[PDB]
Each structure stands twice: as structure tokens, then as C-alpha cells.
Amino acid sequence: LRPQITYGPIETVDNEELTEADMLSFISAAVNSTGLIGYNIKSFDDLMDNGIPQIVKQMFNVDITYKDQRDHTEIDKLRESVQIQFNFTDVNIERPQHRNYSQGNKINLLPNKARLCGLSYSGPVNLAAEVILTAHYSNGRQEVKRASIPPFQVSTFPIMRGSNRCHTHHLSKTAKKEIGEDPN
Amino acid sequence: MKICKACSSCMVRTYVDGNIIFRCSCGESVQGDSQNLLVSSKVYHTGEMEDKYKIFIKNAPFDPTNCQIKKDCPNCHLDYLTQICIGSQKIIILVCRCGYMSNRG
Amino acid sequence: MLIPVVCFTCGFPIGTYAAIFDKARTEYIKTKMGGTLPQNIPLDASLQIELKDLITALGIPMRVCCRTHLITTLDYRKYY
Amino acid sequence: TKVLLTEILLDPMYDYAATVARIDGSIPMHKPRTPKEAEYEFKTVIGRTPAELLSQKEFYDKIYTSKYRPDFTQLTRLEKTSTLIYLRAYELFLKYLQNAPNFNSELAEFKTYENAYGEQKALLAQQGFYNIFDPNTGRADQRTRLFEYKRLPISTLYDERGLPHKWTIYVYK
Amino acid sequence: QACYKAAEARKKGDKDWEKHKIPFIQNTRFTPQMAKDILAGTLTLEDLVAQGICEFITPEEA
Ligand SMILES: [Zn+2]
Ligand SMILES: [Zn+2]
């Protein structure tokens, strides 16, 4: 493919009044575009939205076979091994939460409470799965049982402060300042 | 090397009575005529030979990171050339986009 | 966190003119900043903002230390 | 009661709601010095006593809500302009904790408002800047004393007989 | 091209072949007005990239 855009002639560009102090505006623009640490937030948000779901849904398919050690009936004698096969279908990560010890629903956990109380700024991970169990018999017959598992919370994943799953992402600078966070 | 005519394997070289015999693991045996009289070889100064820099010298006028010199090309009469310095003897070659090459290349 | 009450070096009462000096500064800067955004003011490369006559009109002497500490002191209210 | 009070007194939300309540006089300006004062401040801020809180399962539904409801639609650029930012920030924080409808658009609207406000505050934080101008030009001085390469005549190193110079004789006048 | 035209005139016995050579010019398209527009907040690095004035370079492309 040929490039399309043709710029004006370089003979007519007027730059002789550019001072080396004017060239600091280019550095200003570069730093404003990239931020100073914006790559960290972008990388963590990519891990949250795209990375972990991909890893769980594609790189953790389990397919193993174990010898049947149950030998109490005729079918138990015929059965030789069982094939355990499952994969996860849904992966979600939420914002950090805390119980509050009221025997009530979960509430939001702000970063300053985590810092003071020695808690972890970790958001829950919800997973769903499909399980297939296949049992094999001496003659060569097999039996297959399938189950589908509703979403459940497995553990919590650490949340980068200031990232998408951080609670200081839906707050303003004044609200950040008033919940004990460094607004700057 | 020698390639077997049936299994296309690399036949083993043996020497008998002034003849080179190639024996394969399939039992095939052959005699070399002339092209198999090379037991071993070695070339020196491999990092400075002409065949090492052929692609580089061909691409030199188009690489914008090469040193340019204010000299007229005798072929296309362009007024600058590309100067490159190869080897530990610091051989200087002037090349041009048209195809001109000092050292007659 | 504020302009000091007295000059750090010689002890002249710099602070009694601090508040006034602060607000006057803003007005003076509002006269010269032009179309440049505020946070890019220390990057303009065309600004020439001189506070000499303002500090003189405050009555503060021509001492290096006093004007240094008056001009350069950061205000915590402006960053928090 | 005591464990719940210790749990909630360490919540930044509690401090923010207590500050908002102190601003408009709903609770005393000093920290509680008696258990009665602490109970009253908790009832005012959280909206219910500790015993009626755990009884049930709501927590954020009745947290203080500022008394003066200014008009935040003048935050459309159109005392004020800083009271509005503070009160609207607290109100939007409370809306966030309650998962209120249309929260995500109002948050961006207030973000633009407070970005303009921060532009003003960055104007207030400016201490001045100066550029030394070259009088010959009218902009920042580009005059330097840097080295400038210049091909000198070859006679500065060799004589008319092809020999280098040896500057080892000193002439004194 | 100007070098080629000067050569074509020189080979034809012309005594004013040197007049056909133009001077070389290299420059950046960044102007003082762009520097002022950056400070006014109306020009960003993305606009400079989109206008072909600057581009991103990696150590292997460097
Ligand atoms: Zn050529
Ligand atoms: Zn002093």
C-alpha cells in the first residue's frame, strides 16, 4: 500500500525563531501524554480485564485420569479408571470489600482502612466451571457425567492503588483528599 | 558430504588403497571420483572477508546511518558518496546509490 | 507550609507582608500570563515576570535573603 | 457495640461524614469526650445507633447527607465555587457507595468541573517565571560560549618546509 | 535531480552548469507556534504524532 498524506514542502518551514527553551514544550507534551507512571496502571488494568480471564479460560484446562481403587462390587471390579476433566468458563475480579462485622452484606474497603488495620487491598475473584467425569470399564465401556457449576468466589487478588478496581477511581480529587488519600 | 542414492543418508567416508569409499548404514557403497577429495578445511579472518560484508556493502547507500563524504561519484555525478570502513586494516570503500563502488566492485 | 513569619537568614519580619504579597502576585501574574495555561507558566519561555517593584512597594528592603524567602517559599494551601 | 464502634471509627468514610456534619453544625466541633457524645455523633453520622445497625443489614443507606443542597449546576462554569465542589464531591462519594443510578455520567461531569477548578488552583499556585532575553533578539537568550569547530589553515601546525611547530621559546617584552 | 541537471548541462559544454544546483535543506516541521499551542493546551503529543511531526522510536528501531 502506498502512503497517502503529502506534507507541505520542507523549504517553507519557519523555525529559525525556535529557542532551546521552546523545545521544552515538546518534553512537556511527551510527559503529559505518557504521564509519569501511567504504564503501571495501564498494565495492571490489562491484566485485570484481559490477562487473567484469558489465562484461566485457556491455559488451565484439566484432563487427568486416576486409577479406580474401589473394588467392592461387580461394577467396582469392572471399573478401572476415572477421567476427571474440567475447565473454567467465567472469570471476574471485583473491587476490594470488607465485612464490617455486622453480619450483613459486604461493604467497600477504602485504601486507608487497609493501611491502618493491616488488611489487604484485594478484590474478590469469581469463577464458574464445567466438570466432566468419565469412568472406564474393563470391557471397554465408558460412562460420562457432566455438571455445570454456578459462579463462586475462590479467593481475592491484590488491587493496584489508583487502577480500575481501586475505589479511588470513582472518586474525585476532593473526595480522595477527604478519605485520607494523597490527592496528588 | 555424500548423500546415498536410495535412503538419502549421509554416508561415512573410509580410505582404502588410494580410494575413497562411502559406506552407508543401508549397505550401499560408492566410490568418489573427484569432488570428494576434501578431508577438511579452514578459512581465516572470517569476520573481515569480502563475502561477509556483501549484503552490507550493497545496502550501504540506502542506510541513513552511514557516514557520507563530500566527493563526486564518477558514474552518476552525484556530489556525495557513502564512506564505509571495514576490517582491522581499516579498508575504506566509497559506494553510491547508482551502483558505483570504489575498489572497482 | 507557609511563608515564614521572619526571614530564615536575618530575621526581618517578612511574614507581616506575606498575605498581601501573595494575593498581589496572583493579580500581577494574571496580567502577564497571556493564553498559556497556568501549569505551563514555568515553561512559557516568553514570560518575564519581575516582582521587584511589588516587594519594594510592600516596604521590604533590598536584602537578598528576605526577598529570596518571600519569593520562593511554597504554600501548602496551594498544593493540598 | 464496642467492637463495632472500634471497627467503624477507623473507616475514612466515617471521618468524611463527621467532617460534613461538623461543617453545618449537626455534631459538635470537638471530638467526643464522653460515651454519650460518641453515641450521639455515631447516631448522627451513620444514621442509626450501633445496636440498630447490626440488627439488620443496611449501612450506607442513611449516612449523613449534607444539609445545604447548593446548586451544583452552576458548577457548569456558570464562598461559592469551593463550597459547591466540596459538597458535590461528598454527595457524589455517597452516591458511589450506594451504587446510585446514572452515577458514572455525573462522575465524569464533576470530573470536568473539578479539572477546571484545579486549573484555577494551579493559577493560584504560580510563583512567577522569568527568561533572560538576548537584547539583539527578543526571546530567550541562545548565546553560549561553547566550542565551535573551524578548519584552521595548515600553516598553524607546519612550516613552509613541512615540519611541525615547537612552541617552546617564550618572548618577553 | 538538480545534481543530474547540472551534470547534463556540464556534459553539453555549457559554462553555466553550476546554476542548476539547488542547496540542500533539512529541517523539522516543529514550529514556534506549535510550542505556544502546547502550552495553551490545544496541541498534544497525539496531535503531533497524527500530523507526522514526531514518531515513537524503540531501542531496536533506534
Ligand atoms: Zn553514483
Ligand atoms: Zn533576610
Automatic annotation (TrEMBL), chain A:
Catalytic component of the DNA-directed RNA polymerase (RNAP) that catalyzes the transcription in the cytoplasm of viral DNA into RNA using the four ribonucleoside triphosphates as substrates. Forms the polymerase active center together with RPB1. Part of the core element with the central large cleft, the clamp element that moves to open and close the cleft and the jaws that are thought to grab the incoming DNA template. Belongs to the RNA polymerase beta chain family. This is DNA-directed RNA polymerase subunit beta. The lineage of its organism: Viruses, Varidnaviria, Bamfordvirae, Nucleocytoviricota, Pokkesviricetes. The gene is EP1242L CDS. The chain holds residues 4 to 187 of 1242 of the full protein.
TrEMBL record, chain B:
It comes from African swine fever virus (ASFV). This is C122R. It comes from the Viruses. The gene is C122R.
From TrEMBL, chain C:
One of its GO terms (biological process) is DNA-templated transcription. Transmembrane segments: none annotated. The keyword Zinc applies. GO terms for molecular function: DNA binding; DNA-directed RNA polymerase activity; zinc ion binding. GO terms for cellular component: DNA-directed RNA polymerase complex; host cell cytoplasm. Part of the viral DNA-directed RNA polymerase that consists of 8 polII-like subunits (RPB1, RPB2, RPB3, RPB5, RPB6, RPB7, RPB9, RPB10), a capping enzyme and a termination factor. This is DNA-directed RNA polymerase RPB10 homolog.
UniProtKB/TrEMBL annotation, chain D:
It comes from the Viruses. This is M1249L. The gene is M1249L CDS.
